[PDB]
Ligand SMILES: *C(/C=C\C/C=C\C/C=C\CCCC(=O)O)=C\C(=O)CCCCC
């Protein structure tokens with residue numbers, strides 16, 4: 001079956017690329033410099049952001065003129081809108097995972113409900129380095145020091161991620177690897193309220209086998225990578241529950257009803 | 264078949280399984296024999312209520328596991344006090360165990376302490392699974408058995424300390440692990456590398472890297488028909504962190520509701536900044 005574990009890896013990879021525009025391969029090229037030629041607009045401070053508004057014109061999120069006056073908030077609000085796009089990108093990838101659409105409908109919903117955050121932060125790592133994060137289709141780059149530079153909880157929000165991203169990218173995984181890995185996270189059998197755990201585990205098991213092989217063939221060198229990677233799943237839960245803490249803590253900062261409802 | 268390389272990992276597994284038995288009086292194998300009734304001499308006194316509770320000291324010898332205290336208006340607290348001191352003991356044991364882990368004492372003195380600082384709880388709840396079943400847990404070295412229900416009816420705060428534990432025991436006990444698997448597993452947990460403060464990480468990782476190898480071989484060798492038990496086992500680590508944290512949160516409250524309740528210094532030197 002070690003040609004069945006290599007077919008499923010490929011399919012996932014091929015789907016991973018068909019559902020996600022900005023890839024680890026890409027994002028990584030940008031960040032550094034390596035043959036690209038069109039540098040990103042660096043948001044490093046106030047005039048940077050405001051100029052970034054009509055440059056990368058990330059006025060997809062920025063509009064809804066009932067803001068503009070509250071930097072820290074228009075930024076976090078930005079992540080909101082962005083994360084929502086990702087979620088649709090994730091759902092689509094989900095349906096690519098063999099067996100996923102065959103499960104009970106409620107379970108797919110539940111699996112996705114409890115997995116997006118973990119999947120968002122994992123990929124968010126591909127788009128950041130020790131000094132900053134890539135924004136809007138990788139057009140820009142929002143420095144890291146500028147994010148702490150935000151007042152209330154708005155400067156503790158991203159910093160945790162940075163610490164995670166650092167440990168995560170240290171694994172030096174690529175898109176081939178992350179595709180399968182993302183699949184594993186989704187097929188989590190301990191999501192509360194599931195209905196039929198057996199099918200899901202059977203799938204995650206097939207995924208775990210595929211992910212192990214992927215790691216061996218792709219990183220003969222790196223020992224027990226498989227293990228080190230599964231362990232990071234712990235860091236995601238924490239990063240997440242924690243992130244979801246501020247979401248509450250930060251309900252004390254005056255912040256259309258349609259839009260709220262869209263989130 | 265068996266090769267040079269793999270042979271090194273077998274000696275390692277056997278070395279640790281051997282240190283583990285020598286550091287823990289109540290192995291899982293014994294706990295199970297006690298629990299699954301395969302005995303007429305290993306039967307524990309069951310506690311599911313105050314009367315049973317009262318009878319308890321009147322059977323399951325209690326040299327005051329809940330030291331210095333003829334009593335205390337609350338059983339819930341008297342229990343808590345026992346539970347506390349017991350943990351104090353498990354730390355001591357886990358500690359004797361650690362020292363025997365190849366390379367562990369050869370590390371920076373401070374790191375050794377940070378590994379233990381965080382490793383203790385995670386390890387304590389793993390071992391605590393061994394003493395449980397959906398219905399309760401063993402106490403006093405297997406001599407007694409306190410039901411899940413009793414514990415769950417204790418009182419406002421305290422009636423919330425064990426549930427999360429039973430929660431994990433049921434799922435974890437499902438992997439069907441035995442003492443020899445747990446010894447290597449308990450060893451991996453200690454040799455993390457991402458513990459808050461670890462001055463020198465790398466060396467800690469070369470050790471773990473190896474323990475994982477032992478665990479991987481051990482598991483396959485001991486569960487041939489158990490698909491990805493290795494990975495399924497590693498994921499359970501994420502379950503442990505939550506238990507731990509859920510616990511700390513828990514203590515904190517107690518520290519205000521009951522200003523008369525004391526905590527072991529050692530136990531506090533763990534929690535302080537967790
Ligand atoms: C946003 C905060 C958390 C993560 C939310 C969304 C990230 C979404 C997708 C990751 C990339 C997936 C891919 O490459 O396809 C942090 C920010 O990025 C800052 C938002 C700034 C917007 C103005």
Ligand SMILES: *C(/C=C\C/C=C\C/C=C\CCCC(=O)O)=C\C(=O)CCCCC
Nearest residue numbers: 328342345346349350353391402403404
């Ligand atoms: C402690 C959980 C239960 C303790 C129950 C009753 C305590 C009363 C007497 C104990 C007798 C001594 C003995 O049990 O040997 C849960 C924890 O917080 C972690 C403890 C882990 C135990 C290994």
